[PDB]
Amino acid sequence: SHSMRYFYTSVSRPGRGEPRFISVGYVDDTQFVRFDSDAASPREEPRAPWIEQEGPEYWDRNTQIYKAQAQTDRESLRNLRGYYNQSEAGSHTLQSMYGCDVGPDGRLLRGHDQYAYDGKDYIALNEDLRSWTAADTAAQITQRKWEAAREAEQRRAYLEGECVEWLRRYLENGKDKLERADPPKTHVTHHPISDHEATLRCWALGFYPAEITLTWQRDGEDQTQDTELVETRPAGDRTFQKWAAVVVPSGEEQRYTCHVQHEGLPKPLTLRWEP
Amino acid sequence: EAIQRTPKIQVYSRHPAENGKSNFLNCYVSGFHPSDIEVDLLKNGERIEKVEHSDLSFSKDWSFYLLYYTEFTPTEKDEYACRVNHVTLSQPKIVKWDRDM
Amino acid sequence: SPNGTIRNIL
């Protein structure tokens, strides 16, 4: 089961030129494409090795789409200012996210298409891909325009068709990088706080995909209450890292085990501090 | 306008740090809104010029994330840090690189 | 590949 997503950001300037448009494409937790309107020569560019099979005609075509969407977002930003009666002085943000989820047979599971204005939910295509949920009275104006323009039907055509067919093509071309599960490299470190307590930090490094569970156990019992978890973070090589830390009494370390659940591990892996 | 979200900052190496061993210093900035942000890697207080960043992207709560990264060689003597300025910060926040985190 | 059809304005 896999997903493709496109994330767009448009950021208006207060008479500092037209809005900047940035797009990223993701298959699962791998970025494969990008477009930046502020680049010297704005063009879709590759970000994963498996999209580089695609020839010159693919980058030229997708560049047309982002350039049109940049113009579309610019118009959308002008209208949004009016809906909310905001000054032309302020900088504003329109974000979009759309894409498809497929199963192992490559059949559509779920379609997505939603927008955010200044960090708030604005409008979202419903699960049925025929209707829209508006978050407020400005979004209802958009809803009404789009119901008149039969917009959902065009979005549904892309989500159930094109989206699925592209994701299937990428899953055949990047099969061993996209259906891989890199297991995490795991280790525990020990940092004395004081005379009485020490920190035990459980590391997970170089794993893909990002989804992971680190859990500290004392004599097989969960201590998630006393566990500090960092947010899962990119290593910068398309793999992720995470750590879990628990403050334990000095001399009780051998009673603590770290439990790592990850797709790349056949079953959950159990770690202890190794002095 | 509207909503503002204060950025979370993580400073770390791609690989476990080894003195004299070539590595990558990362500054991961996430959970912020709006997208405008200033990020620098510092070596002994000095801005590193040769730093690359990821393309702007966002999470489930629509908050933004970026990775700023640079090739580096750790030493016992050298200090590295990440400097972040955003509308939500009164002054820039500096997070010192700790090998243990 | 992203949506070929122009998306309507908000």
Residue numbers in the entry:
A (entry chain A): 2 to 276
B (entry chain B): 19 to 119
C (entry chain C): 1 to 10
From the article:
One intracellular protein that is frequently mutated in cancer is isocitrate dehydrogenase 2 (IDH2), somatic mutations of which can contribute to the development of AML via production of the oncometabolite 2-hydroxyglutarate (2HG). Mutated protein products derived from cancer driver genes, or mutation-associated neoantigens (MANAs), can be processed and presented as peptides by human leukocyte antigen (HLA) molecules.
To investigate the structural basis of 2Q1 selectivity, we determined the structures of the peptide-bound HLA-B*07:02. The IDH2WT and IDH2R140Q peptides bound in essentially identical conformations, with alignment of the peptide Cα atoms yielding a root-mean-square deviation (rmsd) of 0.193 Å. The only difference between the two HLA-bound peptides was at the site of mutation. In the IDH2WT peptide, IDH2R140 was held in place by residues located in the β-sheet floor and α2 helix of HLA-B*07:02. Specifically, IDH2R140 was secured via a salt-bridge with Asp114 (β-sheet), hydrogen bonds to Arg156 (α2) and Tyr116 (β-sheet), and π-π interactions with Tyr99 (β-sheet). The longer side chain of the WT arginine residue, IDH2R140, is buried deep in the peptide-binding groove and forms an additional charged interaction with Asp114 (HLA), along with π-π interactions with Tyr99 (HLA), that IDH2R140Q cannot form. However, superposition of the 2Q1-Fab bound IDH2R140Q-pHLA and IDH2WT-pHLA structures revealed a slight shift in the backbone carbonyl of IDH2R140Q, which is the only direct interaction between that residue and 2Q1-Fab.
